[PDB]
Design a protein around this ligand. Structure first.
Ligand SMILES: NC(=O)c1ccc[n+]([C@@H]2O[C@H](COP(=O)([O-])OP(=O)(O)OC[C@H]3O[C@@H](n4cnc5c(N)ncnc54)[C@H](O)[C@@H]3O)[C@@H](O)[C@H]2O)c1
Ligand SMILES: NC(=O)c1ccc[n+]([C@@H]2O[C@H](COP(=O)([O-])OP(=O)(O)OC[C@H]3O[C@@H](n4cnc5c(N)ncnc54)[C@H](O)[C@@H]3O)[C@@H](O)[C@H]2O)c1
Ligand SMILES: O=c1ccn([C@@H]2O[C@H](COP(=O)(O)OP(=O)(O)O)[C@@H](O)[C@H]2O)c(=O)[nH]1
Ligand SMILES: O=c1ccn([C@@H]2O[C@H](COP(=O)(O)OP(=O)(O)O)[C@@H](O)[C@H]2O)c(=O)[nH]1
Ligand SMILES: [Mg+2]
Ligand SMILES: [Mg+2]
Lengths: 335, 335
């Protein structure tokens, strides 16, 4: 069973690549290294002892994607490729819509052309906007998205649903990730974006090891216990295993939706505290204005994935922080 | 004042081109002739005595669109280019999403690059799905779209809104057209799609003049007085004038939404009857199954456009049918 992983050098992909390779799947990566290093795929190979067939380029490049499908016999696709920062998306809507919508459209056109009809799409808790209920289930209504990133994910989910209307032999799996954090236990692979990290924990990790000065906490006036945002942090290794569970267990046509989270919500300040516990020292932080597009609180009821896929995310916030710091300590400038 | 009209050779565009040129605007067309003839632009020039600067190609072709903006000083863009059949869209979602979303994205990227920040977008009553209330106003909630065409229009409206969030110096005008019908009074220009017409009235016109055999009426079990679909038919010349009214009256930043309709709803059978009155003979029709994606009834309250733009569509269903038949009689195979 051969899996094409778009955005295959990124944070969640490389963890997923490991878990697929350890289960005996063959993995192919396409990535443009906009937010990742090719060295990450060398580290996947080192950890697993297994190859990742590497393609370098853009998923919007039809000729490149044609080559990928012509040269390989692909069973499944996991589509991670995308731009993913809520705040940046508000400032750069056309960059987000172009990259995110058109990568998906070029991919689907090539998949259809080759009769490859099994996809896992990397969706997001942001599709729920301001959550109609907490904890969020797969029955919680979607919409009211607050930012072009989240909007783009909901748009893509609808595109994919309409592919299955038009050709119900597809298997579409919409995985709504909450907030993945942490690093492979080896410390040889972890989160390493380009530029200043946009997500909270890679930033916090870098402040903890002295590579950045101060955690910027975006807003303390949300309707939450301490006023900072609340999120369902999930260990990236657990999230990676969730993808393997889909491919192990779903071998029929249909549209399948899962929330992938822990059901444990932590505030920004609580995250910092977990890191301070892992580091054994204070981690400087400052209260800053709200970041556009952020909502107050979102966390998952992941019952459905446990029943249907046999999967549960049980690594803890301390496992997340410790594994993150292990990676960052051993690799302070990343790859 | 120079107006770029994408899809500039199509049905509504060519009527609009006339009305702009008669008011002293300069017009530039980009079209790929997927659903139109270049001869239509010759007929615009003949009627007006004025030139249309013609570009042949795809709005998704960034190099072509760069040439258009580099070679011309554009004030306004009217973005008509799109695929527009509700039923076809259900069968061909990726064709629709690619053409419709990516044309809009390439256009916006080039417009931003050249600081051209005034757009009229061709939107649709389909964005309201099954209407929450009748008649529909601009306060009627959008969503619940039933088909990828309508979905694509609502998606594009959101993209455009997010452009204005990111750069509020834009002028975004979202015109939700109802159902345009008819032809310029000269009979030298009218609706001439490629292949079998997808819209009701060009099909009916062709049956009336003996070029098609039988009107296919899609469904007679809707919750309407006679069971067939009900729509707000608007004369294409009135609709064209509505575009000129926008450009004449809006010269400030912001997002402006208008429903463009008559407020008069007619069933499919009523449309056929108007054509039979115009033709002086029965026009054969058969009841067929529902077309996927169609809803029962939609018609507009266009108060807001009358107040804000000074515009009202008062040509009647008989004006529509007569002008259509005048065109089709004089041009039975179109252009
Ligand atoms: N908190 C999270 O990290 C989170 C939560 C929900 C969903 N997601 C989604 O999961 C996916 C992966 O997230 P991640 O944290 O691993 O981010 P990431 O930035 O590390 O991974 C994405 C990868 O895609 C690549 N890429 C982006 N656009 C591309 C294109 N057009 N062609 C080829 N390569 C492209 C990037 O270079 C990067 O390696 C994204 O779609 C993201 O929106 C992430
Ligand atoms: N009832 C209606 O006709 C109606 C109602 C609401 C909205 N609209 C919208 O108004 C617009 C015009 O409708 P119309 O009836 O004139 O249809 P049309 O098919 O006659 O006009 C559209 C034109 O766009 C061109 N085109 C399409 N994709 C293109 C691309 N990628 N690059 C360049 N050219 C392209 C076609 O060749 C055609 O000439 C469409 O966006 C449509 O969705 C139509
Ligand atoms: O540098 C940062 C990045 C994020 N956050 C906050 O931390 C949480 C998680 O944000 P992130 O960008 O990691 O993920 P998101 O929840 O937007 O997908 C949110 O409440 C953000 O407001 C923060 O305070 N500082
Ligand atoms: O050949 C046709 C085309 C359309 N219709 C019906 O006529 C109305 C207008 O359809 P059209 O495709 O012209 O426009 P739409 O309302 O979908 O934008 C709808 O109720 C359709 O079900 C029909 O019965 N026969
Ligand atoms: Mg091939
Ligand atoms: Mg230029």
């Amino acid at each position: 069973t051969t899996v094409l992983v778009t955005g295959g050098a990124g944070f969640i992909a490389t963890h997923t690549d490991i878990e697929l390779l350890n289960k005996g799947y063959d993995v192919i990566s396409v990535d443009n290294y906009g937010n990742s290093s090719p060295v990450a795929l060398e580290r996947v190979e080192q950890i697993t002892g297994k190859p990742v067939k590497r393609y370098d380029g853009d998923v919007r490049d039809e000729a490149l994607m044609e080559r990928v499908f012509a040269e390989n016999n692909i069973d499944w696709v996991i589509h991670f490729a995308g731009l993913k920062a809520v705040g940046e998306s508000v400032a750069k809507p056309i960059e987000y819509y172009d990259n995110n919508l058109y990568s998906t459209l070029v991919l689907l056109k090539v998949m259809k052309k080759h009769n490859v009809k099994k996809i896992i799409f990397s969706s997001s808790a942001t599709v729920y906007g301001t959550p109609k209920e907490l904890p969020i289930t797969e029955e919680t209504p979607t919409g009211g998205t607050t930012n072009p990133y989240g909007t783009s994910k909901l748009f893509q989910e609808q595109i994919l649903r309409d592919v299955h209307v038009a050709d119900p032999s597809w298997t579409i799996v919409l995985l709504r990730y909450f907030n993945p954090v942490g690093a492979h236990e080896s410390g040889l692979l972890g989160e390493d974006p380009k530029g200043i990290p946009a997500n909270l924990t890679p930033y916090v990790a870098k402040v903890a090891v002295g590579e950045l000065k101060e955690v910027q906490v975006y807003g303390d006036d949300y309707d939450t216990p301490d006023g900072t945002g609340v999120r369902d942090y999930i260990h990236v290794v657990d999230l990676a295993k969730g993808h393997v569970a889909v491919i192990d267990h779903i071998d029929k046509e249909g549209v399948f939706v899962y929330n992938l989270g822990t059901g444990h919500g932590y505030s920004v300040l609580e995250v910092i505290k977990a890191y301070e516990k892992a580091a054994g020292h204070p981690i400087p932080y400052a209260i800053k204005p709200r970041r556009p597009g952020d909502i107050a609180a979102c966390y998952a009821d992941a019952s459905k994935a446990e029943k249907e896929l046999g999967w549960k995310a049980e690594l803890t916030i301390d496992d997340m922080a410790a594994s993150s710091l292990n990676w960052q300590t051993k690799n302070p400038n990343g790859f």
